[PDB]
Amino acid sequence: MKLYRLTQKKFADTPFSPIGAKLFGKRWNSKGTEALYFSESESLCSLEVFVHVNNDPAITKLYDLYRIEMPEYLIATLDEEDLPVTWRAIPASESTQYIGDQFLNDPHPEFAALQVPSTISPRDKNYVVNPNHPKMKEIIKKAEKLDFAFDPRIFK
Amino acid sequence: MKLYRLTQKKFADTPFSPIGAKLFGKRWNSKGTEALYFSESESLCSLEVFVHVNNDPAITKLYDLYRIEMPEYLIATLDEEDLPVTWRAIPASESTQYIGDQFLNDPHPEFAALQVPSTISPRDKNYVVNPNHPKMKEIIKKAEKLDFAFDPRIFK
Amino acid sequence: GIEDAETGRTDAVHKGFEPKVYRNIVERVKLSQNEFQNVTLIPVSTIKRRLKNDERFNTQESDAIYRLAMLLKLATELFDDEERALEWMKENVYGLGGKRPLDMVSTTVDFEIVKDLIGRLEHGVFS
Amino acid sequence: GIEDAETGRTDAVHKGFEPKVYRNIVERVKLSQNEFQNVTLIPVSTIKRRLKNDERFNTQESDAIYRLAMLLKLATELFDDEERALEWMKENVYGLGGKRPLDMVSTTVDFEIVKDLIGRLEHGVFS
Amino acid sequence: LGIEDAETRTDAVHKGFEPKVYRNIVERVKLSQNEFQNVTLIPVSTIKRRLKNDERFNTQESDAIYRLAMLLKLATELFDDEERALEWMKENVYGLGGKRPLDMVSTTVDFEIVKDLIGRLEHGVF
Amino acid sequence: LGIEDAETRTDAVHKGFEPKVYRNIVERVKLSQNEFQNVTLIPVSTIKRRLKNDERFNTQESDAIYRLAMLLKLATELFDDEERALEWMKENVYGLGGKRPLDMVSTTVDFEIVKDLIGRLEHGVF
């Protein structure tokens, strides 16, 4: 699977540091838990961030896009029944926080990523990756830096 | 593959009529050529239409979403080299029109859909479907009407 | 299918739109005389001269006004609301390269482009 | 890492912000006294009384002003442009449930929410 | 064949139409400057003014010329022959109210009408 | 344990804090109304006013109470014991400039400072 991440250019020296997730992540993780956020496509990856800054049509100039290949055998899938009703609330529910935390702080990690539904479009899936997984460094070595082709003028 | 289409509710009696493509299609087809437009995901499908009406956050109330399962064996793929440079121009280039036309008016159609790059995000793929293909009626019979889960408040 | 008794739409353009049409349009679309000039390319002095002398607009001027009124109609059919239609008419549109629909009734080419855009949006066709 | 010689940021809040701070903020953020009251919950009469008598703002008022100034700083760090930072501060944000960032400096809870949003945007974390 | 004198263009109308285009078009449709005036509602003296220099026609005049060219191309696709296309363009039709297709390019609405007519002829209605 | 008197909530501050919350909190942190006044910068007479009826505290006062509760919960997660949490909250620290953690919840900035301190203690710096 091809997964897309983006971060500001200032972080180019450490693009896949779980620090942003630890210090500021609220949806699929709580403070102190290490995590990485990827998306199935460049467009969903771009929307998740740029919707909050949709007034700027040149936001892409502050950011850098990266892509990885995640083996299918270490991608896990959640179930809607385990998902609560408030999972899509803007004040992020602690339930999603703790599902993600359980996946991310889990010792003896068999799977490296968890498929979660996007808050913007639940039928399109984001992926939360545990950096503490063994077979991740290699994936980070094979990562490719892309130029943005998504058009931010969509937000007019 | 799961493909997503949307059309206004007024067309619910004939959701997959190629009439809109014939009368108004400009990118991957020219006037008079029968075609259907689908997208790989609900989000890309939604964006392609709603970006031009991003001032209305309740646009979904005028529309209906549908999904089909397209067999992988009758999905064809274009090549970037055949694609011209102006393929992404807002005044749609006639070259994309004619590539699509060649696919859509082709007698003895082996493939039922052509994978084209989205004008909004080229790495995410739209799909142009020829209704004149034999094994399409069945696909239209199995189609499922969905409720919109995409959030139009993304456009604020 | 004829407006009034014989005016219709084709006969109305060549006969000449009465100034009441301009009055109703400028009240419904909430645009000034300068903005009306900008969208229809009809000179402001010409508009004043039509209004004062109770002279109908000529056929090219009436054709310009017709393209604008047809935009209003098609947009209201698109949104099923006149207010949303007006908001979108005054809104920049990605499918028009960043131009608002009001800037697309000056010629017939821009008018055809915007009509096909409206059709695609109705039928969910990708642009 | 101390502002002036000993003011810093912590000592400044308890010592009391001078009215020059309010003047510079209202010039840079381009908001009226009523809008300043709306964002900081500091009464307009209190602002006038501070300005006329050359009295510094108290510690809770200075804490309110501090949250706003920290929003300005973090947003300017986000966009690398103060103008874009201001536009976004006055812009409704999907991650704030539709509230603009200016409405998120009245308490400390909203301020923490907006700080974490800014951090996520910097590091490309999904909200 | 539309490439020979056109860019296959919306921008060319706002930019203005070059005089070479007027020449090529009035020759391919075989009408005089007075006939051009009658069909495009462009005064013949205005044609002379534009031809005095190499100045381009204004956007409304270029728009009328574009309507003329589009009628020609559509009729040529319809009959699959340009001679038949002209031979139908200069013919008064009862469907168009006693007016020839060439009389239907002065206004946007008449242009829409003649376009719908050509489309119905493509459907081969009998 | 934060669920016992909290909703695990941003809306409750704007809605205003109920008096039951004040009672439960001042009992779990074992401070008098005067001590509450000193730590939250909320006048004790204002506490009496709110307690006269069942009226809720205004958003700024509820905000101070929320800061107090957050300090308690964070320190409890730090020491993994609430008694140790309080026993550290009421202690003047040289890291906080001769002020106890409880003196750091009157303002947003002091709250950020004591939060950073608790975070560094979680890192176990020696």
Cα C127 to Cα A124, A151, B146, distances in angstroms: 22, 14, 23
- Cα–Cα distance measured from residue C12 to residue F46, given in angstroms and rounded to the nearest whole number: 76
Residue of E nearest to B93 (CA): E8
- Cα–Cα distance measured from residue A93 to residue A83, given in angstroms and rounded to the nearest whole number: 11
User: Which residues of chain D neighbour F14 with C-beta distances below 8 Å?
Assistant: 107
**Does C3 reside within a domain?**
no
Q: Is A94 on the interface with F (CB under 8 A)?
A: yes
Q: Within 10 Å of residue D95's Cβ, how many Cβ atoms?
A: 25
Q: In the numeric block, which tokens belong to residue B42?
A: 């609900």
DSSP string, A2-46: EEEEEEEGGGTTSTT-THHHHHH--SS--TT---EEEESSHHHHH
- F67 and D108: CB-CB below 8 Å? yes
User: Which residues of chain D neighbour F67 with C-beta distances below 8 Å?
Assistant: 108
Which of A2, A3, A43, A48 to mutate to probe the B interface, most B CBs <10 Å? Answer: A43
- Cα–Cα distance measured from residue A45 to residue A125, given in angstroms and rounded to the nearest whole number: 10
Quote the minimal CA–CA distance from C80 to chain E in Å: 24
Residue of F nearest to A90 (CA): F10
Quote the minimal CA–CA distance from D99 to chain A in Å: 11
Residue of B nearest to A123 (CA): B42
Q: Which chains touch A (3 or more CB pairs under 8 A)?
A: B, C, D, F
CB C51 within 8 A of CB C22: yes
**Could you tell me whether strands A75-77 and A113-117 are parallel, antiparallel, or unpaired per DSSP bridges?**
parallel
Quote the minimal CA–CA distance from A94 to chain F in Å: 8
CB F89 within 8 A of CB F95: no
Q: Which of A32, A91, A94 sits opposite F10 (nearest CB)?
A: A91
Task: Identify the CA nearest to E38 among candidates E115, E78, E90.
Answer: E90
- Cα–Cα distance measured from residue A119 to residue E26, given in angstroms and rounded to the nearest whole number: 60
Range of the domain at C59: 10-123
**Domain total of chain B:** 1
Q: Which of F8, F11, F122 sits opposite A94 (nearest CB)?
A: F8
> Which runs of E-coded beta strand occur in chain C?
none
- Cα–Cα distance measured from residue A31 to residue A27, given in angstroms and rounded to the nearest whole number: 10
Amino acid at B144: E
Give the strand order in the sheet containing B2-8.
B75-77, B113-117, B125-129, B36-39, B2-8, B63-69, B144-146
DSSP string, A97-124: HHHHHHHHS-SS-S-SEEEEE-SS-TTS
Q: Do chains B and F touch (3 or more CB pairs under 8 A)?
A: no
Range of the domain at B112: 1-156
Task: Identify the CA nearest to A133 among candidates A108, A101, A97, A98.
Answer: A108
> Which runs of E-coded beta strand occur in B40-133?
63-69, 75-77, 113-117, 125-129
Q: Apex CA C54: angle with CA C53 and CA C60, to 5°? A: 100
Partner E, chain B 64-93, Cβ-Cβ below 8 Å? 91
Q: What is the largest CA-CA distance in chain B?
A: 47
- Cα–Cα distance measured from residue B131 to residue D68, given in angstroms and rounded to the nearest whole number: 58
- Cα–Cα distance measured from residue B149 to residue A122, given in angstroms and rounded to the nearest whole number: 6
3-class SS at B127?
strand
- Cα–Cα distance measured from residue C25 to residue C34, given in angstroms and rounded to the nearest whole number: 14
Any alpha helices (H) in chain F, and if so which ranges? 10-15, 19-28, 33-40, 44-52, 59-79, 82-89, 108-122
Task: Identify the CA nearest to C115 among candidates C127, C126, C104.
Answer: C104
Which residues fall within 8 angstroms of residue C72, CB to CB, at 6 or more apart? C25, C28, C29, C82, C85, C86, C89
Element (H, E) at E37: helix E33-40
Instruction: Answer positive or negative: Cα dihedral of F10, F13, F19, F22.
Output: positive
User: Which residues of chain C neighbour A154 with C-beta distances below 8 Å?
Assistant: 94
Q: Which chains touch D (3 or more CB pairs under 8 A)?
A: A, B, F
Q: Within 10 Å of residue B116's Cβ, how many Cβ atoms?
A: 23
Q: Which of D13, D41, D107 sits opposite F107 (nearest CB)?
A: D13
Residue of A nearest to D96 (CA): A90
Q: Do chains E and C touch (3 or more CB pairs under 8 A)?
A: yes
- Cα–Cα distance measured from residue C114 to residue C97, given in angstroms and rounded to the nearest whole number: 11
Q: Which of A10, A37, A63 sits opposite D125 (nearest CB)?
A: A37
- A153 and C91: CB-CB below 8 Å? no
Partner B, chain D 67-126, Cβ-Cβ below 8 Å? 91-92, 94, 98
Which residues fall within 8 angstroms of residue E21, CB to CB, at 6 or more apart? E5, E6, E65
Quote the minimal CA–CA distance from A124 to chain B in Å: 7
Contacts 24+ apart (CB under 8 A), C10-15: C10/E109, C10/E110, C10/E113, C12/C62, C12/C66, C13/C59, C13/C62, C13/C63, C13/C66, C13/E107, C13/E109, C14/C59, C14/C62, C14/E107, C15/C56
Q: Is E10 on the interface with C (CB under 8 A)?
A: yes
- A91 and F122: CB-CB below 8 Å? no
**Does C106 reside within a domain?**
yes
Quote the minimal CA–CA distance from B2 to chain E in Å: 35
Q: Within 10 Å of residue E99's Cβ, how many Cβ atoms?
A: 15
Q: What is the DSSP letter of B27?
A: S
- Cα–Cα distance measured from residue F124 to residue A31, given in angstroms and rounded to the nearest whole number: 16
**Does C20 reside within a domain?**
yes
CB E21 within 8 A of CB E5: yes
For this entry, resolution in Å reads 2.8
- C41 and E60: CB-CB below 8 Å? yes
- Cα–Cα distance measured from residue B73 to residue A84, given in angstroms and rounded to the nearest whole number: 38
Cα A42 to Cα B150, D50, D109, E90, distances in angstroms: 17, 52, 33, 55
CB D43 within 8 A of CB D51: no
Structural determination approach:
X-ray
CB C49 within 8 A of CB C55: yes
Size of interface A-D (CB pairs under 8 A): 87
**Domain total of chain D:** 1
- Cα–Cα distance measured from residue E59 to residue C104, given in angstroms and rounded to the nearest whole number: 13
Phi and psi at F57, nearest 5°, equal -70, 150
**Does F5 reside within a domain?**
no
Which residues fall within 8 angstroms of residue C114, CB to CB, at 6 or more apart? C71, C96, C101, C104, C105
**Does D88 reside within a domain?**
yes
Q: Which chains touch F (3 or more CB pairs under 8 A)?
A: A, D
Instruction: Say which residue the tokens 């008197």 belong to.
Output: F5
Which residues fall within 8 angstroms of residue F96, CB to CB, at 6 or more apart? F103, F104, F113, F114, F117
Any alpha helices (H) in chain D, and if so which ranges? 10-15, 19-28, 33-40, 44-52, 59-79, 82-89, 108-123
- C122 and B8: CB-CB below 8 Å? yes
